[PDB]
Amino acid sequence: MTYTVGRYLADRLAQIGLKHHFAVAGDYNLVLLDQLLLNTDMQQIYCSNELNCGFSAEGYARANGAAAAIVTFSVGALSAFNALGGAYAENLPVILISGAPNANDHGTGHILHHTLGTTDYGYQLEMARHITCAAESIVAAEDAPAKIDHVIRTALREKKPAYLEIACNVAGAPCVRPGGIDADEASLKAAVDAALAFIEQRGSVTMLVGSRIRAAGAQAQAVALADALGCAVTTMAAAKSFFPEDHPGYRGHYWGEVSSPGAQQAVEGADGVICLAPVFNDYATVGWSAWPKGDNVMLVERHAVTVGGVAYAGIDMRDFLTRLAAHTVRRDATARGGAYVTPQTPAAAPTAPLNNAEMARQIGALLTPRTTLTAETGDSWFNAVRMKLPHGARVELEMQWGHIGWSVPAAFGNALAAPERQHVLMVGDGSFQLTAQEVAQMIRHDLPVIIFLINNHGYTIEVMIHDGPYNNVKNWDYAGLMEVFNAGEGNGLGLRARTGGELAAAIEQARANRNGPTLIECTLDRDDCTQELVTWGKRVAAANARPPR
Amino acid sequence: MTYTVGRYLADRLAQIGLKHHFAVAGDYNLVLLDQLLLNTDMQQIYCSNELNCGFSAEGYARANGAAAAIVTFSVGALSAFNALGGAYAENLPVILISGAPNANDHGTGHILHHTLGTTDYGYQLEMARHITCAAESIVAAEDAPAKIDHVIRTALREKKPAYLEIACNVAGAPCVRPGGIDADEASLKAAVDAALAFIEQRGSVTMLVGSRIRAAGAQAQAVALADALGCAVTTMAAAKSFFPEDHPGYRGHYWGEVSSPGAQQAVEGADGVICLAPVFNDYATVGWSAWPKGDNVMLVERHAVTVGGVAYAGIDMRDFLTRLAAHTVRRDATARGGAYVTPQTPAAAPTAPLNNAEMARQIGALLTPRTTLTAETGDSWFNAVRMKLPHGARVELEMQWGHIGWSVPAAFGNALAAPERQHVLMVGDGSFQLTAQEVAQMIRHDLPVIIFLINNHGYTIEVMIHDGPYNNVKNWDYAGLMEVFNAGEGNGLGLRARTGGELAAAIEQARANRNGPTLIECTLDRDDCTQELVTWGKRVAAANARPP
Amino acid sequence: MTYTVGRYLADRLAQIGLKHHFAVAGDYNLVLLDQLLLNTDMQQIYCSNELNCGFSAEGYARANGAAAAIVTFSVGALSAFNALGGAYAENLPVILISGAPNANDHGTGHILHHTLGTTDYGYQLEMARHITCAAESIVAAEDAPAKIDHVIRTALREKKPAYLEIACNVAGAPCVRPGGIDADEASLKAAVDAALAFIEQRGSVTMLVGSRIRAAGAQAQAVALADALGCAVTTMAAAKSFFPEDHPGYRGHYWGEVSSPGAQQAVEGADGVICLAPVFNDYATVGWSAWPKGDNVMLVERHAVTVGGVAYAGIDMRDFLTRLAAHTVRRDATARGGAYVTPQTPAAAPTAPLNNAEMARQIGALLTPRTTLTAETGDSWFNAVRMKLPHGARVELEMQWGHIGWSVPAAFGNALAAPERQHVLMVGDGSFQLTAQEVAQMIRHDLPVIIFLINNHGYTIEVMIHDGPYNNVKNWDYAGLMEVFNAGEGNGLGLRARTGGELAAAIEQARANRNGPTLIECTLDRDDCTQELVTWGKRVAAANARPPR
Ligand SMILES: Cc1ncc(C[n+]2csc(CCOP(=O)(O)OP(=O)(O)O)c2C)c(N)n1
Ligand SMILES: Cc1ncc(C[n+]2csc(CCOP(=O)(O)OP(=O)(O)O)c2C)c(N)n1
Ligand SMILES: Cc1ncc(C[n+]2csc(CCOP(=O)(O)OP(=O)(O)O)c2C)c(N)n1
Ligand SMILES: [Mg+2]
Ligand SMILES: [Mg+2]
Ligand SMILES: [Mg+2]
């Protein structure tokens, strides 16, 4: 059986540790999908639509480290681009492979199906270059190994996604086989010496862990530096779970005036803040109100540290933090005697109407060290950041891209990447409507994801930035949807919870559904949301609206 | 009270004839949506997601002439771009407007939500320029009139979509008000004389009507020319319904070896073919096998005619066709003796298992002159092109872009644009799962769309180009979905038809459902499809696979 | 004195070893040029126009390793882009820095001078992304270190050029200071083991050295492998000088039917060819006639080797060649008893009309181990590739980009990068007309470049692909131009040579001009060119013209 270009790609994807890749068929990729099916270290997973395909691969990469999605030219890839730009924003090496016109059509002027109807077939690549770290087109088998290895090696080095298109008559063409793997003292001393003087010369220091720290591979080194300093540690909201909440120095999330108790003063009252790989965007800074920077910040990024008025280039954040931790003095003033303060809401009477605080209390009680909680944009961001996490629990947030509906397909991909964990999904009713059909794929693969669907009858987070008729949604019977997707062949279970007692019974049933997803539709009033959402929403709306010049 | 940049856009959109625009809210567009709401000539319609928002605008433009969709930066617009590229492919002036960063963030290096996380806000405009005829960004109210009028005037002139983004703090900023409207004889003589010579020198001439003729506004002039020539007239598959099927010269669709009976010889056996605004792509030419071109073809395009070895530029197709029809000789040889042959499927025994031919027969019987039949990519293309159309019936096909799932939001937008017509949607089960949630918006607006969902358990069209496990889909209870979307406040109705008797009884219940959509889930075997799909699919596949 | 963004860039450019950078002033870069003037490890050099500016930096990088050019927005940068795409094509890390609009104009709709007159100021960056490996815009000083270090570190790693624009009011803004520096066994064993089996299983092997081998840093390792194998070694034309011509295995250039004697048979008659970092384009393959590839080629590239039907990724060409050389058996059949054969033209009678072969004989006799010979596109490519090189002599060719006129500004930049060497420039009269004014800069800096200007009254190389009235040029008094550029303040010398005796006397005078350039205008008939030009020109023209499908 002749070895082909598509096999070359399949074998490299398996080699970088994918166990699955995601696809939607179209004639320009069918031979490629057949070549990928020959690799039996991976399962080929089919998605309902390409936007869902792309966010399933994004969710898979959060657990696995990388992922791949394969789509057809133009009508598949342009939807997958929203999710690919999402992977770029969230520092995940997703490889999007699109099927593409037969190479013999290049140079002809032939107009081809799925294109704009002009002689141009390069617009899709051109568009992809704006949202990836590498983008290549294979029209000849002899070029395929260099292009495949370039796109995979660059994506994995940068932790950013990349794009590959393969002419449809070349996916099955003969190719060579893959071999090998796609899977500075003075500078470091100067940077470490400056960071040690920054700590030593201050009376108090607090660490603030940012949401690029996973992409830097530096989470364990952050803990070593926290152990050595004994300082208060806080996380930015989008870094929820990236630092252990049972560490004796952890004091919660820093998010300006919506911080955990004590955390705003820990960061803003300290003589120096050590910021590890942050994303200071308008939402994270609460409309530019909460943004530690400048001479009293040691800004540590994946290949540079800026401290004491100097940017030290050429140093790896991991080696830096390890050396700094081995030599620093202790600065424990912002931690001593303090603790991380989490909500302590008393249980509601079981028959009272369900409210947000009761629902969040029951969800937080479900978390284990083995839980992965995917939380959608909406008030679920604020309920998730408020949860006290058992050590080992993972929270996945998409706070820089913020595409509502990401969470459904992302929970499906994560559940396939990490089947040993307990997957829990918190998604609002508005977000659910964009990508709901990927629950039918959860059902198809008997994945036991527990989904809390928060039915507050519209886009409550927008109701709290700026209200209007556009925040209303058509209501669905969300719980009844599960039987519709099972269609007599599936173990999906849909339950409704209108009280704390109904929610607790629904949760018991969900935990007992071992071979399919359970959706629990939790009914809340439209204005029953976290206080933090309202305080943040005000500040961020005022920032968006601020008047020209 | 103070007139704003978003009211200037709203008023221009109303001025070009929109009665609706489509939107998905996000913080970058809310002020803009509040300004659009002030125009009471339009209704603002909310969509489940942005791919569906864009394709509802595309289906609305097919009936209305134009459309607009409003989305938020990046997370909204990048999915709407698939639909915008689809409006370019299908020659429809959809205007996509996206909300965008506050103008005071430009020049700062601020990182913003919904972006790539870099200091770049211009990637979205840059991407949009590849799929539109005009693309502008407003960051200052002083510029907004020239940029709104350039995108709308260019889109309407070119019959192609356009892109506008408006900084979120500028949509509510004061603006001037809109006034005025956004809504060669020697060359024509030379072209008409060469075309007259082309016809007079030939004994058998046939017309082939192409799917860019509606973008040219030349459908009535094509009828005038067919009346003068008396010749056979055929339509390309994607031009279904663009020429009237009761015309005495109509001889059905030309589609190479899957043509209506006699139509392949009408075109391929003629001494000349008059080709009106065709798209000869790989699917239309049946893998490059069926492609009339060259010295024996008069190729008539929007602004140019190529005939007799010369390309005549600067002539409007409408004026050309009217002058040619007024002077031409008659050439009726290709019509003599012939007729349009359409399927004559006998009615099945009512309790026999449903098959595709029976389902197609009953859907064909439902069509009227006031029907719009939206037909999805899949075997529904072949069942639609085979339908005998009453004069005036409209069929909508998306055969150049061909994005499965387009039909659901496109039928929703066409139902809002043309509420006086009877809307019928044929959609396959695989396609329905990409965009199904827009049926909930049909229910929200009480639109009486009758939807035939063909449940043959997978992607049968693909099963016929090249089969594999990727053609299987997770089955749904499609009928039972209607009550889920009603959620106690809607008039959607879901029915199942497993026999011709059950299908006839479901169609009569669907016709009686006047205030909400009815989905009839028709069960067919995977391999029970038209013969034309099988024949077309193998040619088309062989062309895709041809070796380096 | 406050440290600024422009200083940050100046100090990083000095740190990567530039001794000069090239500039043309415009109001959008004047404050930046003032910040660069503060670094006294570099000289700021002014160019006549931006295309010349960009090719002076390209020539400088060939000697130095890297280079920088600074230009004004749009009217400067778009000309510099031709030279930047040239640097990409020739694998040289040139950094182009453009001055750019004031940051406060972004977001205003202001129309600005030097732009297209629309509200768009991003088109220049967008265009630059197609011809560089990194492209960034600085509009805020706090972003400047990351963007500067990203563009320099990426350019130096990739050996490709990069682009940076800096808002004009930010070049002088305060900035932090620069610290630190911008300056796999199993895979390697598998690749080496396969390459050793490739050699061992064959009776004869020949090495073919390609013009990407400098960018790979692998020239010394190629010599070690040639020493170990004892095989015939040949160079592709564009690799002239990248392998030592006095090595006992060297047998000249392989260039199909225009190869050195014996070299075509060495490569095409061998059982296996080891190809080191080649560029097989239409000119190198002589119109696709001479292109060793496939199962009998070991293709060695900077990070991959393809041999024995496998592409081994993840291995550095230098480590690979060193390990291969340490273990290979000898395969000397294609070298034994052979020698590199070079032209042996007898000296012309001194008073006979000068002809090409006599001119090339005198130029070849001028070369020393310390010579850098820059040779322009035209018949000078074929005269240069025919020269026998003393060990250490460098030849610079621009055979992939092939922009006529490159050679003038490239010889000026090289002469500044490497003033310890003897610089010689061979440029035809047509090419000279595109960029002649950079000889006035050679004069301004007293650079003793000897220029042979071949005046054959038009574009003789095109006359031999396809003749027409477009191959004629307006003749100039090239030798008289030198006094015009000196304008009473310069040591440029212009001489004419119409015979071999006049050329020899002119050369003596040139060698004696120690403080300025000498141009010797050599008069040749239009059809007096190398035989190789005519044979190559035919083949490459036939390839260009070959008929649609
Ligand atoms: C693709 C996309 N379109 C629009 C938005 C704007 N958006 C941000 S939050 C949100 C509503 C989320 O509503 P829901 O999921 O019901 O969450 P709630 O706040 O009610 O819990 C919207 C429309 C977005 N973020 N992404
Ligand atoms: C967005 C998109 N992705 C993938 C494709 C490839 N595609 C062409 S037809 C088809 C299947 C259509 O299946 P169905 O709607 O069930 O129609 P059938 O042929 O079964 O009646 C596919 C997947 C496409 N055209 N568009
Ligand atoms: C910028 C640019 N424009 C046009 C060309 C096409 N070109 C290739 S060689 C050449 C003529 C070179 O003439 P000359 O320098 O007189 O060299 P000769 O062959 O006569 O020695 C031309 C015009 C090119 N290579 N670069
Ligand atoms: Mg909600
Ligand atoms: Mg189907
Ligand atoms: Mg010349």
PDB file of C-alpha atoms in Angstrom, chain A residues 9 13 16 18 20-25 29 32-33 36 42-47 49-61 66-72 76-77 79-81 83-84 87 93-99 124 161-166:
ATOM      1  CA  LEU A   9       0.155  14.170   7.965  1.00  0.00           C
ATOM      2  CA  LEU A  13      -0.355  14.246  14.093  1.00  0.00           C
ATOM      3  CA  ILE A  16       2.735  14.834  18.508  1.00  0.00           C
ATOM      4  CA  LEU A  18      -3.186  13.445  19.236  1.00  0.00           C
ATOM      5  CA  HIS A  20      -8.397  12.111  17.861  1.00  0.00           C
ATOM      6  CA  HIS A  21      -8.818  14.632  15.134  1.00  0.00           C
ATOM      7  CA  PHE A  22     -12.060  16.381  14.137  1.00  0.00           C
ATOM      8  CA  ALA A  23     -13.619  16.562  10.669  1.00  0.00           C
ATOM      9  CA  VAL A  24     -16.479  17.560   8.499  1.00  0.00           C
ATOM     10  CA  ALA A  25     -16.424  15.820   5.105  1.00  0.00           C
ATOM     11  CA  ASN A  29     -11.098  16.426   1.650  1.00  0.00           C
ATOM     12  CA  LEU A  32      -7.461  13.069   2.796  1.00  0.00           C
ATOM     13  CA  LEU A  33      -9.948  11.756   5.399  1.00  0.00           C
ATOM     14  CA  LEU A  36      -6.118   9.866   8.067  1.00  0.00           C
ATOM     15  CA  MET A  42      -6.232   8.282  16.341  1.00  0.00           C
ATOM     16  CA  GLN A  43     -10.019   8.238  16.111  1.00  0.00           C
ATOM     17  CA  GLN A  44     -11.556  10.430  13.427  1.00  0.00           C
ATOM     18  CA  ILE A  45     -14.452  12.385  14.974  1.00  0.00           C
ATOM     19  CA  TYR A  46     -17.181  14.018  12.884  1.00  0.00           C
ATOM     20  CA  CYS A  47     -18.683  17.357  13.871  1.00  0.00           C
ATOM     21  CA  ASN A  49     -20.659  22.052  11.429  1.00  0.00           C
ATOM     22  CA  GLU A  50     -17.213  23.587  10.943  1.00  0.00           C
ATOM     23  CA  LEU A  51     -17.425  26.297  13.586  1.00  0.00           C
ATOM     24  CA  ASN A  52     -18.185  23.460  16.105  1.00  0.00           C
ATOM     25  CA  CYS A  53     -15.415  21.381  14.529  1.00  0.00           C
ATOM     26  CA  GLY A  54     -12.881  24.154  15.071  1.00  0.00           C
ATOM     27  CA  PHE A  55     -13.977  24.772  18.761  1.00  0.00           C
ATOM     28  CA  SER A  56     -13.960  21.026  19.508  1.00  0.00           C
ATOM     29  CA  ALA A  57     -10.318  20.975  18.422  1.00  0.00           C
ATOM     30  CA  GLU A  58      -9.692  24.119  20.518  1.00  0.00           C
ATOM     31  CA  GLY A  59     -11.207  22.414  23.648  1.00  0.00           C
ATOM     32  CA  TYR A  60      -9.271  19.188  22.870  1.00  0.00           C
ATOM     33  CA  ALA A  61      -5.959  21.144  22.709  1.00  0.00           C
ATOM     34  CA  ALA A  66      -2.475  20.259  20.478  1.00  0.00           C
ATOM     35  CA  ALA A  67      -5.345  19.303  18.145  1.00  0.00           C
ATOM     36  CA  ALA A  68      -6.336  19.099  14.495  1.00  0.00           C
ATOM     37  CA  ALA A  69      -9.536  19.807  12.520  1.00  0.00           C
ATOM     38  CA  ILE A  70     -10.068  19.001   8.857  1.00  0.00           C
ATOM     39  CA  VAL A  71     -12.576  20.840   6.713  1.00  0.00           C
ATOM     40  CA  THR A  72     -13.540  21.449   3.084  1.00  0.00           C
ATOM     41  CA  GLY A  76     -15.866  24.729   5.673  1.00  0.00           C
ATOM     42  CA  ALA A  77     -12.709  26.708   6.360  1.00  0.00           C
ATOM     43  CA  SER A  79     -16.408  29.084   9.611  1.00  0.00           C
ATOM     44  CA  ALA A  80     -13.470  27.160  11.119  1.00  0.00           C
ATOM     45  CA  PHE A  81     -11.449  30.459  10.936  1.00  0.00           C
ATOM     46  CA  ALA A  83     -12.436  29.107  15.945  1.00  0.00           C
ATOM     47  CA  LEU A  84      -8.847  29.255  14.583  1.00  0.00           C
ATOM     48  CA  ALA A  87      -7.168  29.295  19.252  1.00  0.00           C
ATOM     49  CA  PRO A  93      -1.751  24.972  18.756  1.00  0.00           C
ATOM     50  CA  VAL A  94      -4.740  23.803  16.711  1.00  0.00           C
ATOM     51  CA  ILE A  95      -3.774  22.773  13.117  1.00  0.00           C
ATOM     52  CA  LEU A  96      -6.583  23.445  10.618  1.00  0.00           C
ATOM     53  CA  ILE A  97      -6.240  21.397   7.475  1.00  0.00           C
ATOM     54  CA  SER A  98      -8.491  22.238   4.553  1.00  0.00           C
ATOM     55  CA  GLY A  99      -9.018  20.225   1.422  1.00  0.00           C
ATOM     56  CA  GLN A 124      -8.550  31.395   1.718  1.00  0.00           C
ATOM     57  CA  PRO A 161      -2.546  27.671  15.561  1.00  0.00           C
ATOM     58  CA  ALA A 162      -1.532  27.033  11.998  1.00  0.00           C
ATOM     59  CA  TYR A 163      -3.186  26.308   8.642  1.00  0.00           C
ATOM     60  CA  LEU A 164      -2.481  23.779   5.919  1.00  0.00           C
ATOM     61  CA  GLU A 165      -4.426  23.252   2.658  1.00  0.00           C
ATOM     62  CA  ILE A 166      -3.794  20.132   0.558  1.00  0.00           C
TER      63      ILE A 166
END
